Amino acid sequence: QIVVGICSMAKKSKSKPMKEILERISLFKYITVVVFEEEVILNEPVENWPLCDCLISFHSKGFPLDKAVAYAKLRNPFVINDLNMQYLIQDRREVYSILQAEGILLPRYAILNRDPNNPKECNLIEGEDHVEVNGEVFQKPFVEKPVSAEDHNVYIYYPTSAGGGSQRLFRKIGSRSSVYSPESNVRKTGSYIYEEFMPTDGTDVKVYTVGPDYAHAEARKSPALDGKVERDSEGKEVRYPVILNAREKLIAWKVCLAFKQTVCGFDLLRANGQSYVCDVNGFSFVKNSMKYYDDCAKILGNIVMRELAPQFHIPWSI
Numbered sequence: 588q589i590v591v592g593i594c595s596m597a598k599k600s601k602s603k604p605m606k607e608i609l610e611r612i613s614l615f616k617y618i619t620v621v622v623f624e625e626e627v628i629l630n631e632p633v634e635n636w637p638l639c640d641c642l643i644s645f646h647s648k649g650f651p652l653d654k655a656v657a658y659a660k661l662r663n664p665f666v667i668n669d670l671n672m673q674y675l676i677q678d679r680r681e682v683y684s685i686l687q688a689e690g691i692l693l694p695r696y697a698i699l700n701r702d703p704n705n706p707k708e709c710n711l712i713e714g715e716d717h718v719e720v721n722g723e724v725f726q727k728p729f730v731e732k733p734v735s736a737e738d739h740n741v742y743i744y745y746p747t748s749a750g751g752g753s754q755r756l757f758r759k760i761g762s763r764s765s766v767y768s769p770e771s772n773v774r775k776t777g778s779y780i781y782e783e784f785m786p787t788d789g790t791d792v793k794v795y796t797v798g799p800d801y802a803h804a805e806a807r808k809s810p811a812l813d814g815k816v817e818r819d820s821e822g823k824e825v826r827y828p829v830i831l832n833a834r835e836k837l838i839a840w841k842v843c844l845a846f847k848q849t850v851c852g853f854d855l856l857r858a859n860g861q862s863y864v865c866d867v868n869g870f871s872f873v874k875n876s877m878k879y880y881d882d883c884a885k886i887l888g889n890i891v892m893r894e895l896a897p898q899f900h901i902p903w904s905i
């Protein structure tokens with residue numbers, strides 16, 4: 588048997604989408620799936636972790652990525668989502684740097700790095716209706732994002748002409764994804780990316796790749812619109828149908844390859860007749876799409892077989 592090891596925090600490994608996909612991969616006659624226990628991941632040395640031939644491992648809050656890297660170096664499995672790239676995906680600055688290097692359209696942006704010790708000595712000038720970051724001018728509306736990609740306190744600043752103030756986004760709490768604040772001035776502590784607001788029809792497009800030649804997309808109400816989450820009867824966020832155009836399919840191909848994450852989620856803003864990437868999340872599955880589960884498992888199984896069937900002397904055809 589070819590062993591596929593799944594290495595992540597239990598919150599992820601035991602999530603319903605993961606279980607749905609893993610039972611389908613387990614359908615491959617020559618593949619056995621082994622899910623690494625969180626207790627083992629956290630508390631055992633990598634030398635004691637289970638063996639695998641193919642490793643699906645991904646960082647989320649609390650995950651010891653240093654251990655995952657050392658395990659991969661020790662055992663040399665075929666790695667589905669590259670582990671070292673997952674350090675970079677945690678830093679919005681690194682993500683945007685990569686997108687630019689790949690000729691991928693993204694919002695015009697500027698980075699404000701702040702020395703916590705001297706927080707006023709950085710390159711920011713603020714007016715009522717604009718900021719200037721390293722000399723670069725952002726008129727309101729603009730977006731302010733923490734440089735840590737794991738910090739979801741993204742703020743949007745409204746122009747005087749629209750009543751000023753700001754929209755404060757956050758990880759969803761029940762029925763809310765954001766709140767309006769009368770505060771008009773930007774945050775005074777922390778490092779931030781400042782970027783142009785891209786006007787959309789009021790939805791985000793979420794893209795989920797499984798390798799460079801497959802991408803599923805769906806839309807949802809922009810969390811900044813008023814912050815009330817649209818929920819269905821099962822308490823799931825309302826998702827709308829999307830089909831990616833030829834340009835967007837190429838974006839997905841580029842993102843998947845550039846970040847070396849076979850399974851990769853990212854966000855598109857359809858604005859001004861083009862599509863801009865504003866966020867790259869790495870490993871992410873679609874929730875509540877049976878067809879996605881079927882396709883994702885099929886593709887991952889095929890990738891595994893294509894790569895490893897020869898060395899195991901197993902017949903494999905495309």
Ligand SMILES: O=P(O)(O)O[C@@H]1[C@@H](OP(=O)(O)O)[C@H](OP(=O)(O)OP(=O)(O)O)[C@@H](OP(=O)(O)O)[C@H](OP(=O)(O)OP(=O)(O)O)[C@@H]1OP(=O)(O)O
Nearest residue numbers: 599647648739758759793823824852854866868870871872
């Ligand atoms: O906090 P994390 O980053 O470790 O996990 C979050 C991550 O899931 P992942 O592991 O990547 O599959 C989000 O997807 P993502 O990667 O596109 O992230 P971005 O926001 O673009 O960066 C997801 O938002 P969404 O895409 O479903 O709206 C969010 O669901 P949640 O707010 O609960 O949404 P509801 O289930 O209440 O509707 C998860 O929060 P928690 O599960 O509470 O931890």
Ligand SMILES: Nc1ncnc2c1ncn2[C@@H]1O[C@H](COP(=O)(O)OP(=O)(O)O)[C@@H](O)[C@H]1O
Nearest residue numbers: 694730739741783784785791809810854865866
């Ligand atoms: N430049 C932008 N223009 C318009 N809306 C944006 C822009 N950047 C982020 N947003 C909105 O804010 C939301 C959260 O920002 P995002 O970069 O995806 O951060 P997070 O990592 O917290 O998901 C996006 O889904 C989108 O609705």
Ligand SMILES: [Mg+2]
Nearest residue numbers: 613615616618
């Ligand atoms: Mg099997």
Ligand SMILES: [Mg+2]
Nearest residue numbers: 758759760761
């Ligand atoms: Mg949640």
Ligand SMILES: [Mg+2]
Nearest residue numbers: 796843849851
């Ligand atoms: Mg991918």
Ligand SMILES: [Mg+2]
Nearest residue numbers: 854865866867
């Ligand atoms: Mg996002």
Ligand SMILES: [Mg+2]
Nearest residue numbers: 646647868869
């Ligand atoms: Mg993540």
